[PDB]
Write a protein that binds this ligand. Structure first.
Ligand SMILES: Nc1ncnc2c1ncn2[C@@H]1O[C@H](COP(=O)(O)OP(=O)(O)OP(=O)(O)O)C[C@H]1O
Ligand SMILES: Nc1ncnc2c1ncn2[C@@H]1O[C@H](COP(=O)(O)OP(=O)(O)OP(=O)(O)O)C[C@H]1O
Ligand SMILES: Nc1ncnc2c1ncn2[C@@H]1O[C@H](COP(=O)(O)OP(=O)(O)OP(=O)(O)O)C[C@H]1O
Ligand SMILES: Nc1ncnc2c1ncn2[C@@H]1O[C@H](COP(=O)(O)OP(=O)(O)OP(=O)(O)O)C[C@H]1O
Lengths: 349, 349, 349, 349
């Protein structure tokens, strides 16, 4: 769903004075054909008859005007009602798949002016918005909640396995028995989890005011996952990688590329051609994820640490004195990295 | 939703005969305009024609009367039905955004008398309640259960993270590696979680008898959250703070101030102006939470233990003989404090 | 809700050929007045006119017959349709609160014959069943699911805290630091949890075929809780108690008595009058719950173990040889009790 | 639901133009009687009058035609609309339980030609699909999402218990204190959980494009359950069993036999006739699950380790040098088996 159309969907999202009107029209089983224009004068050729109101907009007035047939003309910002009961005559040569005069009129006029034309059918409790060559049929509020509510439950399930794979990876990390398969499997889950968040966004928008709780649940469930995936890529890619580079690696698998096991490892710098070999590829964490997350050391300074010790396993074996040898690591930091790592070793493993 | 309006909302909440009648009227597609007065003689200027019934109220009777057009006058305690089919004539000078005579009349009368006036649209399946300058549109039962269900799940997600943070803080507390970030990070979550409860509160009232399960769940999810937050504050404020004093800090952040990371660290007496400075501020718990929570020690008595040992870290290394010196701590209290804390140590770390 | 009425509710539960009919009648907005009799001849005085069909019952035929007005007379087992379009004339002296002839007729006739009379109102999408002095209005399927679904979520929340209190009690048990408050608090939660299961039963029935998944969720959530509460009572009551006695103690708090802290301990044999003293009452588990549950020793044989060692703490301190001194405990059992206890001590604490 | 019928159900599943049209017809309260044939000339005896359109299908066109009375004839691939307003005349000798001419005609025609015939009642919001001797009443989208949502939660509860049991078994496995009850108790739960998936499968198809989230969740909840069960069987059957052989045992219990405690212990080769005898039967895992699952060792290679060490308990005490003797186990595999198992030991026990 194009961001171009999503802004127009926002005009009839729950919470807007326009949807309040459109809801009353549906509940009362009336029909409607609304033309949203920033200037009536520009479209005098397609607007015939009806009455010239040119009055302040109001959900109550639009509903009231929807009792007469014909089309109603509103300003684009929904602050003025220009006409009512007008006969819209769009270009008859414009292709339309619709079968009824009300919707054939709506599609054609939308395609012709580039303006938003809303058509509410009398026989069906449906709102159809026509923008460019787009046609968005408004889902019923309850359905959306029910759809969004499912998306969330699917997210929670994914988040669950993600956490499990992550806590298992942490154990192999602290024990230095991690394999490419372990890393990749974990990235795949995170990526899919974030892909589902993206595929759900449009519905969170069609919900307007009513998508509040959904945004909150989503944010609580995906809070640190991206920072976590970026750190994973930084720690497990074949050759040294920059924070920013990993972030592009994250976005790439969230949109373009498919998070396939063999595809991921490839993008991480490993030349594998069969998902089985992954189990046979040993790999060691640089220590970025643990240094930042646990040790609380800024990535900038973490670079200096990894620069000198190379891997988490080696960082794990340095004294509080060897750690201070690093630019950026004083006495406190040394304690940090050291205690937080020895603490995780005495618990997780 | 002003508490003043909620009291009037209770009148048409699921479970009440009035709503029972109103639901009937909705199902049968009838309209209505109910005027609730404590004394008809006090409004004989706005009540006209109709029939004087002066009889006992009943969901069944109200429904029957709803088949007639016009208004129905009920007693404020919903025990009497005074008139039916009356013509209401309120102050015409009162501005109204409504467009239909039923609603125009409903809002003007309410705003003129301060009395409750309920309007049910004949064309829409909607109940509207006018009190002072308020207009409450009664939501369909299913929608609330839905919306309240979602809020519960939102609380759930928040409470989960709350738990992850609190348990992570505990681990740190036991290892005496706590920072200001860790503490503040936990309060914010706890604070947000209670704010959400607050915002849901009204809908739980708009469910009448149908908000029993929701009340039960909310209680199970928030049970000891407030106490826990009150305790976390007493242990981590810059300078010793009294119980009651911490509670106001708790309320303050639920309603007034926003649980913003830096705003919280300031309210606790830690002059900071940058959230990044937190990961560098070290802090030691007083021991109040653990003393009271795990060791079942009264806060007044806790004051002494903390006064003599200064930090949880020290209370943690205290011998039973050491703990006995403290005024109020007997031989049992000492074992209690001693054994309960060591038990955690061995388990959590 | 009396079991007497619940059997009659089963006649129109989803899944029954009768509800299938009643659903079609609602969806088609028709009305109906169904009289369920085991013999028409007995009620010839109240059944006038209409047509004598005396034919096989069928959801399709009843729906079809519901298009004519008047009442339809069916056999009690829903296998025959005796009449249609009949005029039912019940006792006019029987008190009724109804206001319409269709429902005044239904109530009166139900009160008079003791038979089931179903009234479906044309204006409202509602099914009203009248049995004795009972009147059950059928809830809409979707609502029930939504109600039952909430009940379940409330159960899961309770089950959650229950498990937490239980795993915390297990720790104090293995460490022998349990107090009356610890035991009681845990019983209270379990009792309430089971009380909610009972208060939900009627809805699980009104759901018929559609309550399948709900029964399954309930059973998965409450599976071992009762056996667990019985064992708790056996281990923590002041004076030795029999399995059966505890079971009556369980049922009592699930129906009659209220699971109040001070009420429970009292029933457990402790003379307390203030919920605060509970924290000051030390108590030791006999070892029944652990011996049966973990050690797998039949309660009958567990009695012999408790008879000789008295408490779990002492059972916890016996050698594999001292344990064999008990009637019923050979070499294997000794290993059992011993290893399972030492295993829990090396993990939970 | 025979797979034969599900293939025809796919035709009116959310996402298809036909259902799109059918939903329109439902909303506008129109009725319909659609006959799907691959060749009209083959049924010119049952098609009468009406209009010969022979045009391209379209959800919009079908809807338009639904305003006319009579039947509509479509091609089986839903790309052509042959007739509209036709009078269908099927074999009158075919018995039918239907009472209205539309449905009587619908069932007789379907049963006479083997072709699909869809009837939409004008009075009820219902779609009915007749194939052979089958009658599928299309459930309203919201209800399925609901019912499927509940089944997912049921799976959730089952999967939870599954997890509790499996992890409890693991603990026992590591301590070599496993009984036959513990093993069988776990399989039953695993078995029930997959049976439920099976029973839900059809509804997930009746959701068309709207069963994507449900498919995703189901996959996240059952992902490795089957493999896990296949492995638990290979480790605990009375006598060594081959992989494929265990899978049939798995299928057998999902479809045929019931996961009854005693029935399962018999299928595994443990002659028992009383569930109480189980708590007394001791059993030692082969080590296949742990070898393959945790130690990432192929089952074919696992055969050797198990062949030489007999039990997991022994594999567990095996040195790296010991593990190297086994054909197929190199220096890495040994460390893998050795380190991975010890890691569990230290963590789980
Ligand atoms: N060019 C137009 N300008 C203004 N109004 C139009 C125009 N074309 C059609 N209409 C409106 O169409 C209305 C009739 O509805 P109709 O076109 O039959 O579809 P409907 O009523 O929405 O039901 P369905 O479209 O079949 O679901 C009446 C008329 O005011
Ligand atoms: N002052 C009044 N006193 C008594 N009844 C009134 C008064 N004003 C309006 N009504 C009632 O209004 C009823 C007509 O309905 P109306 O006012 O058009 O709104 P509606 O029928 O509910 O539809 P909408 O609310 O516009 O969607 C008929 C009349 O009994
Ligand atoms: N004694 C009776 N025997 C048979 N049918 C009766 C009898 N009394 C009333 N009825 C039926 O009542 C039907 C009329 O419906 P009515 O009594 O007005 O309530 P309704 O139609 O269900 O709507 P509401 O009850 O107001 O929700 C018509 C008639 O067949
Ligand atoms: N043989 C047939 N060929 C074409 N149309 C038929 C045939 N038989 C019945 N119909 C259609 O039946 C329609 C009338 O509806 P009807 O058969 O009474 O059921 P309905 O209207 O759907 O209500 P119910 O199904 O009884 O709840 C009108 C007619 O076009």
């Amino acid at each position: 769903v194009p961001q171009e159309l999503i802004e127009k969907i926002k005009l009839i999202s729950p919470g807007t004075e326009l949807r309040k009107a459109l809801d009353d029209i549906i509940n009362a089983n009336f029909g409607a054909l609304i033309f949203l224009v920033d200037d009536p004068k520009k479209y005098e050729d397609v607007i015939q008859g009806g009455f010239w109101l040119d009055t302040d907009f109001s959900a109550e007035k639009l509903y009231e005007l929807s009792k007469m047939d014909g089309a109603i003309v509103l300003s684009e910002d929904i602050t003025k009602i220009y006409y009512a009961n007008v006969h819209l005559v769009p270009d008859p040569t414009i292709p339309t798949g619709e079968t009824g005069t009300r919707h054939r009129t709506a599609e054609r006029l939308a395609k012709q002016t580039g303006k938003v034309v809303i058509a509410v059918s009398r026989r069906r409790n449906i709102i159809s918005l026509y923008y460019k060559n787009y046609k968005y049929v408004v889902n019923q509020v309850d359905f959306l909640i029910s759809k969004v509510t499912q998306a969330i439950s699917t997210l929670e399930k994914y988040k669950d396995n993600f956490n499990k794979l992550l806590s298992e990876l942490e154990v192999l990390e602290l024990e230095n028995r991690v394999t490419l398969a372990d890393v990749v499997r974990t990235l795949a889950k995170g990526f899919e989890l974030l892909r589902i968040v993206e595929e759900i966004r449009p519905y969170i928008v069609e919900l307007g005011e009513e998508g509040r709780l959904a945004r909150m649940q989503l944010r609580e469930l995906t809070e640190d996952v991206d920072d976590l995936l970026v750190l994973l890529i930084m720690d497990y890619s074949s050759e040294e990688v920059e924070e920013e580079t990993a972030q592009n690696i994250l976005q790439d698998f969230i949109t373009r590329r498919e998070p396939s096991p063999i595809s991921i490892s490839r993008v991480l710098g490993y030349d594998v051609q069969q998902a089985a070999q992954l189990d046979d590829v040993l790999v060691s964490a640089r220590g970025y994820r643990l240094l930042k997350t646990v040790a609380r050391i800024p990535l900038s300074i973490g670079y200096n640490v990894v620069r000198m010790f190379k891997t988490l396993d080696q960082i794990s074996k340095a004294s509080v004195e060897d750690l201070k040898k690093v630019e950026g690591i004083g006495e406190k930091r040394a304690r940090a990295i050291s205690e937080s790592i020895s603490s995780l070793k005495h618990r997780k493993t």
